Design a protein around this nucleic acid. Structure first.
Ligand SMILES: *[C@@H]1O[C@H](CO[C@@H]2O[C@@H](C)[C@@H](O)[C@@H](O)[C@@H]2O)[C@@H](O[C@@H]2O[C@H](CO)[C@@H](O[C@@H]3O[C@H](CO)[C@@H](O)[C@H](O)[C@@H]3O)[C@H](O)[C@H]2NC(C)=O)[C@H](O)[C@H]1NC(C)=O
Ligand SMILES: *[C@@H]1O[C@H](CO[C@@H]2O[C@@H](C)[C@@H](O)[C@@H](O)[C@@H]2O)[C@@H](O[C@@H]2O[C@H](CO)[C@@H](O[C@@H]3O[C@H](CO)[C@@H](O)[C@H](O)[C@@H]3O)[C@H](O)[C@H]2NC(C)=O)[C@H](O)[C@H]1NC(C)=O
Ligand SMILES: *[C@@H]1O[C@H](CO[C@@H]2O[C@@H](C)[C@@H](O)[C@@H](O)[C@@H]2O)[C@@H](O[C@@H]2O[C@H](CO)[C@@H](O[C@@H]3O[C@H](CO)[C@@H](O)[C@H](O)[C@@H]3O)[C@H](O)[C@H]2NC(C)=O)[C@H](O)[C@H]1NC(C)=O
Ligand SMILES: *[C@@H]1O[C@H](CO[C@@H]2O[C@@H](C)[C@@H](O)[C@@H](O)[C@@H]2O)[C@@H](O[C@@H]2O[C@H](CO)[C@@H](O[C@@H]3O[C@H](CO)[C@@H](O)[C@H](O)[C@@H]3O)[C@H](O)[C@H]2NC(C)=O)[C@H](O)[C@H]1NC(C)=O
Lengths: 100, 100, 100, 100, 99, 99, 99, 99
RNA sequence: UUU
RNA sequence: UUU
RNA sequence: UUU
RNA sequence: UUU
RNA sequence: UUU
RNA sequence: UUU
RNA sequence: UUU
RNA sequence: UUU
RNA sequence: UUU
RNA sequence: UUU
RNA sequence: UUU
RNA sequence: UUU
RNA sequence: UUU
RNA sequence: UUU
RNA sequence: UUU
RNA sequence: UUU
């Protein structure tokens, strides 16, 4: 099971994806509860706590810091949007604290 | 029944969520009308008036001021996006008029 | 039939809404074609031409200028987002060329 | 088959559209796999590599540079949003490296 | 004389120029008063009222509307600064109403 | 005297004015010290503490809060600069708390 | 001489420098005219035409394109200002075309 | 002496201060050269190299990293300018690394 | 099947 | 900080 | 049923 | 300007 | 039907 | 750079 | 079943 | 301020 | 686009 | 010393 | 936070 | 004239 | 909105 | 020389 | 990156 | 007083 979230207002807009379908999913903080679909869209009203989603017998933790890094990539790509060949690559270079 | 909205153009992008399904829902200002689904996505063309949604025998009022506070959190999180560990927390501190 | 669009990249993100269901819908510029659903989501790859959507025997024209006014309201509401009681109202006052 | 994507956080928010239905679709980088629907929404967690989607016996390549050009059009349309008659047209003129 | 101002905080930073020299200069709202030099720099604390300068017997009125047009040209030149050959020119066409 | 400052980097750029002349001026945090001229420009390296200037025996205190209000008026005038007739006026109403 | 300008509203704020002194200086579009001092500050009301300064017999032309590159470096240094060690350096590589 | 600079286009605008007076001042990269006055204003065309000033026998080095921190404080004070009582203070904590 |  |  |  |  |  |  |  |  |  |  |  |  |  |  |  |  794969979870990808983007920032939406005060919380997050998310989806859970498993190529072989999602058979069960729950969250202590996000509005999703299923006890078969391949993809489920859901939101989290707050990200003060990190996003926690149980899905297909697998606990998934998407840190709020990770969500801010993604929005940083989105923000600086739009900033460098007049340079469309290097905008995203330079945004990843500035926003990802890992490696260089 | 739970209603969460984010700003979209001149109005709002919303969804109504009830873990035990939504059996009836209406709105004097938003495009939604059902007389069973667990989650319903809908928009409101204008937020000049506060979002009012009746859902499962329960009147829900999401103030436009509340929606602006959420967009404020989104805006300043993207502003502080180069500091991914404190960006959201500092945005909540600036945008939420409650408490400190 | 009601059509509401917001700007998405180079084009627009739209939905068509009729409380009594949508029985037919088409567009010369947007990716939608049905010949019964109450709500249909669709996008338009370009808004160089104004959005034209035929829906339930009714031609609907959402001008690109109208879409920019909505994004203006969204932009300045986020600008005034530290003043959540007047942010949207002041954004409507600046972005809507009609009346005052 | 038609693919349209917008930037969403670190990756992209996409949909695949074929007026005569989508019978098969896959992607080496995006979360989508079907082996009949007219429209399929899906995301790509990263756009470091260009978006590649096979759909209805047709390989589709949406370059990341192309996605940045679209976000540029979105960014400068919001910038010129106080001039709703020329905002989008002037944004296309600045952000599209082709022709003039 | 010749008066040129730019916005500075709540008011404006100005300069009075005259090749033959500034013999006398005063203002009802700006901090300048002389009763000869070619160049006199001064500030105006507020621009709620237009910048009015009496210099060498001529009434100079730099409208705040005009100052905002200049600040508009500066703002959009910085926004278009990745396109240096067209940044200033495109900013003039977007900011000057009479073009 | 009359003191007017605008924000400059971490501190502020200031000017002291007096039509009759500045006889003496000092400051505990700004680079100015004289013990007559009508106009004296000086800078303050930091504004963590309010700009305090002792000029002609008068204690001048320009609060940093006041300087930020002026920078607010400048910032929103540039944001509203496509509307030159109302840019400065609308920026004053959004930035000045006592209005 | 040496001429350095930055954008100021619709035009530019400039400075002419020469260690041996500025003996004469003029301009067809900027407010400066002298016919010796080491340093002369002056403004140009418009930069629709490039800043042309005739100083000590040398023709100085500071292209508006060059001024926008400098304003680009200033703008992106402020945008990258949370990364102070690389802000100016990264802004130079994004703004200077010949790098 | 005391040197304070702010970013100006591609380089910086600076001021050298000394209550007892500036007897001599030079720089390898900035336009200033004297060999007494209390205050000397000068500009540096580039800040790719740190602002180095030799004033009264003391070596002054204002790192470009330090100048960007000051520009950071200015930028976020304008962003927080609707909150004038906490704008400067909050900008200091976000921009100064050693806090 | 703790609502 | 969607009540 | 002009692809 | 999603090919 | 290489997991 | 959604683990 | 006020359209 | 999606007509 | 300082008149 | 073209006002 | 100009050392 | 505390370097 | 420099008091 | 209205403090 | 003021030539 | 290297133009
Ligand atoms: C929620 O869903 C998970 C995942 O469901 C499993 O994976 C899907 C992709 C489908 O293939 C489902 O059919 C499949 O059950 C459930 O967790 C899984 O539970 C089963 C219980 O039978 C586990 O199987 C066991 O596996 C162990 C070794 O791992 C063997 O020794 C056993 O003999 C038995 O085969 C399976 O491993 C486990 N998977 C994971 C990832 O934990 C979960 O039970 C379910 N919960 C509820 C309440 O329905
Ligand atoms: C719209 O939907 C609401 C909510 O529906 C109720 O809650 C859902 C989660 C499901 O469990 C539904 O099956 C359930 O009806 C309706 O409001 C509800 O109406 C019922 C009428 O039978 C109310 O039950 C009564 O409750 C009182 C005490 O509250 C008892 O004394 C009665 O004997 C009877 O049991 C129920 O309380 C009420 N719930 C709420 C939150 O108001 C509503 O009727 C419905 N409207 C239409 C037009 O369908
Ligand atoms: C596409 O859909 C429209 C709209 O469909 C109509 O409205 C929906 C809300 C549902 O109630 C549908 O059942 C309904 O047909 C179609 O346009 C409609 O076509 C009908 C044809 O029978 C028109 O009815 C006529 O109306 C005139 C007066 O208006 C009478 O004199 C006739 O006797 C007859 O009743 C109806 O007015 C018309 N509606 C509109 C808004 O134009 C359309 O035909 C359809 N197209 C296709 C290809 O299916
Ligand atoms: C994935 O889907 C594609 C596309 O599917 C085709 O187009 C859709 C719009 C529907 O009409 C489908 O019914 C249709 O199959 C498949 O590619 C297609 O495969 C067929 C195989 O029969 C090809 O037909 C052949 O075409 C050649 C000439 O092109 C003739 O000489 C043959 O006699 C035969 O008719 C068809 O051309 C091809 N289309 C494309 C665009 O490649 C694909 O097979 C499928 N894959 C899987 C694994 O299902």
């Amino acid at each position: 099971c794969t979870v990808f979230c983007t920032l939406a207002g005060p919380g997050a807009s998310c989806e859970a994806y498993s190529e072989n379908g999602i058979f069960n999913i729950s969250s202590p903080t996000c509005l999703v509860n299923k006890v078969s679909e391949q993809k489920i869209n859901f939101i989290c009203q707050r990200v003060d706590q990190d996003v926690v989603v149980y899905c297909n017998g697998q606990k998934k933790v998407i840190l709020t810091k990770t969500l801010v890094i993604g929005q940083c990539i989105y923000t600086f790509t739009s900033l460098f949007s007049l340079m469309p060949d290097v905008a995203h690559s330079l945004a990843v270079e500035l926003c990802v604290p890992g490696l260089h």
